[PDB]
Symmetry: D2
C-alpha cells in the first residue's frame, strides 16, 4: 500500500487513453463559447478539444468550462495552442476575428482573409486530415470552396452553413405573424446571405405541407400586407442589430450546433448551407452557394434541386455569378 | 374564408395564454446569457422571461436567443424593461454589474450595493411575490439576508449560492491529481468565499464513501505533497484568473443552472450555498453563511449540521462573526 | 440530537408537499409501461402518478420503476388503486384491456366498452376535474366524444390520438423506399384508423415542402410502382403483426408520449388525432374524426381544414357518416 | 430527370454506410425491450442493432421500435437472425430465457446454461471480436468468467453487473425511511446477489459523505429499529416480487442502461458489477465477484479495494469460495 487507493493503473487492460471520436472549435471566443456551451450542453462529447491563437482568454475561458465539468458529462477537454492536439477528430470549426465589417454586405473579401484562415487550417487538417470542416465567415460560399480547395476533398469535407439561419428568421416572425407554432410549419430560402437572399414562396405552408398560395392568394408587393416587406425586414433583421453583435453568435452558434449535431450523428436529413452545385441543375462554373441538402457520416450525401423560374430563379442564379465574375481577379493565394 | 388558414382562435377552449410555471434572469449579460444558455438548453421552460435595466443589449441579446428558437423547445420568452412582465413566476435571479472589484477579497461591501440591488428587486417581488430568489454578488451571505430581509421570508425565499462552486474546484483538480473519475468521489468545504474558505478533510473520500484518511495518513502541511497547498491554490484558482473574467460566469452560471435545476424540479437533494444557520448547531446571532443543505419545491427544507472541532471549526465559525462585527455599523439602508 | 441528522423538518418553510403539475396512466400494463418508460425517460415529471384496477402487476411493475429511481430524475411516483390520489394533475390516460379483437377492423364497438371505460373515468375526472384526457381504444373518434361527453368539455378536454401514428407508418417506409432522411420530408392522412384510412397525395413532398407531384407524375394504380399498394400495405402494416402485439404498444405509447410531450409543454404545433370537426369545413352532425390540428396549454386550440375534392374527399367524408349512421342505434349508456 | 428528386447517390463522397460505433441486445424480449427503450430513448445510437434466436417477436417487436423512429433520433436499427450483422460494434449484451427459476437463490447453475449462452456468444464475438460483453444471468460472477474465458480477454471484456442494483435498493428505501433525497446520500454492498449480499455500514452517510455511524450509534440487531432487518428486507425485496417479474427487468435494464451509458461514453467513474479480483486485496483463486470499480473506453480500468474486517469481511470473502469449491466439479464445458 501507499500509492493512495487500491489497485494501480493496470488491472484489466492498461495504459492508453482512447476516446473514439472527438471534436473542436477555433472560436474559443464568442461563437466559440456559444458553440462550446450548446455543444458541451446538448450531448455529443466522447472527447472534446478547444483552441486558438490565444493564450490568455484560453486559460480563463476553459476554467469556467472545465469547472462546470461536474454539471455536464464530457470527461475530457484539452486546451493548448498551435494545432497538434486536436488531431483526434472528425468535426472542426474556425471563425477568426475579422468576421463582418460591422455595417452591411457581409465581407465582400477573402483578400486579407486568405491569411487569417490559412495559417490556422492547413495545420489542423494534417493532424486529423480525416475530418470535415465547418467554415463560417460572411460569404460562406467564398470560403467553403477556398477551404475545401486548399484543404482537401470537395463535397465530402466542405460545408459552409448559412441558410438554416435565414430560414429560422424567415419562419419564426412570419409564423408568429401568421398566428401559429414553433415546430411545424414551413418554407425556404436560396442563395447566399443578404443583399439578394431569395425566398421560395412556391412552398411556404402551414402545419400541413398543404398550401398557403391557394389561399392568401399569390402576389407580393401588390397587396399591402407586404409579404415582400416581410423577407426584406428579415435581411435587415440579420443586418442592423449593430448595437449588439455576438448575440448573432448565440443563435449563429446554436444553429451551427444544430448542424454539427445533425452532421456528427448521421441523420440523413436536410440542411441548406452551401456545398456543391452539380446535382443536375447546372450552375455557371465552379458555382458555389447553398441549396437545401442532406448531411451525414463523412459530410454530405445529396443536395435538393429546384424551383419555379420567375425571375426569382434568376435572382438566385445571378448573384453567385456576378461575384465570382469579379472574384475571378480578386481570387489568388 | 380569408383570415388565412382554417379555423379561428376559439374552437375548443379559447382566448388565454397559460404557461404554468415560468422564470427569469436579471443577468441578461454574461452570467445572464451563460445562465440563459444552460437554461434554454437543458430542459426547464414551460415559460421563460428575461430582463434588465438595459434597452440595447436586450434587443440584440434576445435576437440570438429568440432566433435559436427552433433549435430548443421553449415556446415563449419575453423581453422588455422595468419589472411588470416577469411576474408570472417562481425562480428569479439578479446579478447587477458591480460584482467583484477585479482584484481579491470578494466585495467587502453592501454600501453602494444596497442601491444596485434594491431598485431592481422590490419591483420583481411584488409582481411574483410568490417566488424564491437566487442572489449572487461576492459575499453571498451578506446579501441573502439583505435580500431575504427587505425582500420577504427567511429560509423559504433566500438562497445565496457559493459552495457547490468551491466543491467543484476542490474536487476536479484533486480527483485528477488523485487519478480518478469525474462523477463519483467526494468531500466538502464550509463557510464563505475565499480568504478563509475552509474544507473538511474529515470526509474526503473516493468512489467508496470509505476513507482516504486511514490511508494517505492525516497531516496537512507536515508532509510536502501539500494537501494544504492544494486548497489554497484553489482559492487562488477562484482568484487570479483576472486575465479573463466572465468565464467565472460560464461555470458560475452553469453552477447556478445546476442549483436552479435542483431547486426548480424538487429533488430533495443537497447543496451548500448559505441559507439559515439555526438547524441546531448554534451560530452567533443572525448568523448567515453556508453549510450543505437540501433544496426543493418552495426553496429549502433542511440544512446539514456538523464537523470535527479542531481550529477548522473555529476557522469556519470566526469568519462570519468578524465581518458582521464590523458590518453591524456598515449595515443600514 | 438523536433524530438522525441535523435539523428537523421545518427550518425555512415547512410541512407540505407541493409538486406543481403532475400526471398519470391507467395502462400500468404494456401501453402503460411503454408509456411510463418513454415518459419516465424523456423529461416531464415534476410529479407522477400511476394506477389501475390491478393490485398485483402494480406492486411488481412499480418496483422496477421505483428502483430505476436513481437513474432518472422524477422525485415522486405513487401507486395505489381506485382513483383518489392521481387527482393532483393535468394529463391522464386510459387504455383498459379489451383494445382490439386480435383480427382486423378496430373494435366496431362501444357496447361492452361503455362499461370498461366508465367505472374508471368518472372517478379520475372528479378528483382532477381540471385536466385533459387522452383516450385510446380502436375507434378513437367513437370514444373521444364518448369520454368528452360523459366526461366534461368538448374540444378542450377530449383528444383521441390516431393519425400521427399512420403518418409515421406512411412516412418511414415510403421515405426509405424513396431513398432519404428520417427527420425532414412530408405528407399526411385523414379520417380514422384502417379500412378506409385516406392519405393526401396532394402535399406529399421531400425535404423541400416543394412537390413530388410535378415529378413522379400523379396517378395511383395506373403505373405499377404502386403508390396505391404502398398505403394499403401500411394499413396492413398496422394490421397483421398479429404474431406480436404489445409492440403496437412500444410505438403506440411512444407516439402518445410524443403527443403528451407536445400537449403537456404547450408548443402550439400540429398533430392529427380527432377532436372537433367544426373549424369551418362543415361535417355531417356531431361529426368526430381527425384532421391535423394544434395542441397546447389546456388541450387544443385550432384544427387545420382542407383538401382536393376528388372522391378522396368523399372517401374521408363518408366513413365517419356510415358508422354514426348505425352507431346512432348502438349508442346509448 | 425521372429517378425522383434532384441528384443521385454520389454528388460529394458516395456509396458507403459508415456509422462509427454501434451496439446490440440479445434480449429483444423483456430485458431486451426494457433495455432497448432506455437506450433508444436516452441518447446513444450513432448506429444500433437488435437480435435473437427468435423470428416472430422480432418482426413484431421492431415494428413498434422502428415506427417510433420519428420520435427518437437513431437513424438505423437492424433486425435479422444468427450473428452476422451486429458485428459493427463495441457493446453487446445477452440474456437468454432461462434466467432465474422463479423462486429463490439465483440460478446455482451453469450446467444447462453453458449451452444457452455459448451457441449465441462465440458467434457475436468473432464478428465484432473487438468489443466488451455485459453478461446477465443470476450469478453474474459465474458467467462473467465463463463468458470472459471462452470469450476473450479477462478484465478488458467481461463485466457482470449486479451491485449497482442492490445499492439502489439499499439506498432509496433507507433514504426514504431516513427522510431525504433521491440523488445525494450514500453507502454500499459487496459480493454477489442474495443469500449473503453483504453491505458496508462502514461508510453509509448522508448528503455530506460525513458520518451516520457517530450518530445513530453502531450496532445492528441490538437496537430494534432493525438496520439489519432493513438490508434483509431488501434481499427479500429483490426476491419475492414473484407475482410480477419482467419489471425486475424494467429496473434491471434501466440499471444496465446506466452501466452501458457509463461504459459506452467513457466517464472514468465507479460501478460495482464483478470483474477481476486482483487489485491487491488477494482473493482465493480465480476469485470472481464484485467490488466497486471504474469503467471506460474498452471496458474497465481499476477496482476499488477495501473494508473493516469484522466477520462481514469473511461474510463477503467466504461466499465466493464455497461455490467455486463445489463449482470446481460442476464446471466444465
Ligand atoms: N454563419 C452565420 O450565420 C454567421 C452570422 C454572423 C452574424 C450575422 C449572421 O449572418 C446572421 O444572420 O446572424 C457572423 N458569423 C461569423 O461568426 C464568427 C464568430 O464571430 P464572433 O462571435 O465575433 O467570434 P469573434 O469574437 O470574432 O472571435 C473570438 C475568438 O476568435 C479567436 N480569434 C480572433 N482573432 C483571431 C485570429 N486572427 N486568428 C485566430 N483566432 C482568432 C480568439 O480565440 C477569440 O477569442 C465571425 O467570423 C462572423 O463573421 C457567422
Ligand atoms: N456565485 C459565484 O460563484 C460567482 C462567482 C463570480 C466570480 C468568482 C466566483 O466566486 C468563482 O469562484 O468563480 C462572480 N459572481 C457574480 O456573478 C455576477 C455576474 O457577473 P458578470 O458576468 O460580469 O455579469 P455582468 O457582466 O456584471 O452583468 C452583465 C449584465 O448585467 C446587467 N447590469 C449591469 N449593470 C447593471 C445595473 N447597474 N443594474 C442592473 N442591471 C445591470 C446588464 O443586463 C448587463 O448586460 C457578478 O455579480 C459577480 O460578482 C458570482
Ligand atoms: N392509438 C393507437 O395507435 C393504438 C394502436 C393499437 C394497436 C394498433 C394501432 O392502431 C397501430 O396502428 O399501431 C392499440 N391501441 C390501444 O392501446 C391499448 C393498450 O394495449 P395493451 O398494450 O394491450 O395494454 P393492455 O395489455 O390491453 O392493458 C394492460 C393493463 O391494462 C389494465 N387493464 C386491463 N384490463 C383492465 C380493465 N378491465 N379495467 C381497467 N384496467 C384494465 C391493467 O393495468 C393491465 O396491466 C389498447 O386499448 C389498444 O386498443 C392503440
Ligand atoms: N442483473 C440483474 O439485476 C437481473 C435481475 C433479474 C431479476 C432479479 C434481479 O437480481 C433484481 O435484483 O432485480 C434478472 N436478470 C436477468 O435478466 C434476464 C432477462 O429476463 P427477461 O426479462 O425474462 O428476458 P426473458 O423474458 O427471459 O427473455 C426474452 C427474450 O429472450 C430471448 N430468448 C429466450 N430464450 C432464448 C434462448 N434459449 N436463446 C436465445 N434467446 C432466447 C428472446 O428474444 C425472448 O424474446 C434474465 O436472464 C434474468 O435472469 C437480471
Amino acid at each position: 500500500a501507499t500509492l493512495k487507493e487500491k489497485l494501480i493503473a493496470p488491472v484489466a487492460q492498461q495504459e492508453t487513453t482512447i476516446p473514439d471520436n472527438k471534436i473542436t472549435v477555433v472560436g474559443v471566443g464568442q461563437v466559440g463559447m456559444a458553440c462550446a456551451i450548446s455543444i458541451l450542453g446538448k450531448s455529443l462529447t466522447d472527447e472534446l478539444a478547444l483552441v486558438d491563437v490565444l493564450e490568455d482568454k484560453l486559460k480563463g475561458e476553459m476554467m469556467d468550462l472545465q469547472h462546470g465539468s461536474l454539471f455536464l458529462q464530457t470527461p475530457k477537454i484539452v486546451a493548448n495552442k498551435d494545432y497538434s492536439v486536436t488531431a483526434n477528430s472528425k468535426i472542426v470549426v474556425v471563425t477568426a476575428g475579422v468576421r463582418q465589417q460591422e455595417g452591411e454586405s457581409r465581407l465582400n473579401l477573402v483578400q486579407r482573409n486568405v491569411n487569417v484562415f490559412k495559417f490556422i487550417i492547413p495545420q489542423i487538417v494534417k493532424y486529423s486530415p480525416n475530418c470535415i470542416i465547418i467554415v463560417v465567415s460572411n460569404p460562406v460560399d467564398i470560403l467553403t470552396y477556398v477551404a475545401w480547395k486548399l484543404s482537401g476533398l470537395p463535397k465530402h469535407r466542405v460545408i459552409g452553413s448559412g441558410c438554416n439561419l435565414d430560414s429560422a428568421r424567415f419562419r419564426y416572425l412570419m409564423g408568429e405573424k401568421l398566428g401559429v407554432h414553433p415546430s411545424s410549419c414551413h418554407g425556404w430560402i436560396l442563395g447566399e446571405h443578404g443583399d439578394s437572399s431569395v425566398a421560395v414562396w412556391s412552398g411556404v405552408n402551414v402545419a400541413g405541407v398543404v398550401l398557403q398560395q391557394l389561399n392568401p392568394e399569390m402576389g407580393t408587393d401588390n397587396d399591402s400586407e407586404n409579404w415582400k416587406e416581410v423577407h426584406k425586414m428579415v435581411v435587415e433583421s440579420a443586418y442592423e442589430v449593430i448595437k449588439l453583435k455576438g448575440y448573432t453568435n448565440w443563435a449563429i452558434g446554436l444553429s451551427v450546433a444544430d448542424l454539427i449535431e445533425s452532421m456528427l450523428k448521421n441523420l440523413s436529413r436536410i440542411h441548406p448551407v452551401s456545398t456543391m452545385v452539380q446535382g443536375m441543375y447546372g450552375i455557371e462554373n465552379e458555382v458555389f452557394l447553398s441549396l437545401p441538402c442532406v448531411l451525414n457520416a463523412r459530410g454530405l450525401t445529396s443536395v435538393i434541386n429546384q424551383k419555379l423560374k420567375d425571375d426569382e430563379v434568376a435572382q438566385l442564379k445571378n448573384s453567385a455569378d456576378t461575384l465570382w465574375g469579379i472574384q475571378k481577379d480578386l481570387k489568388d493565394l
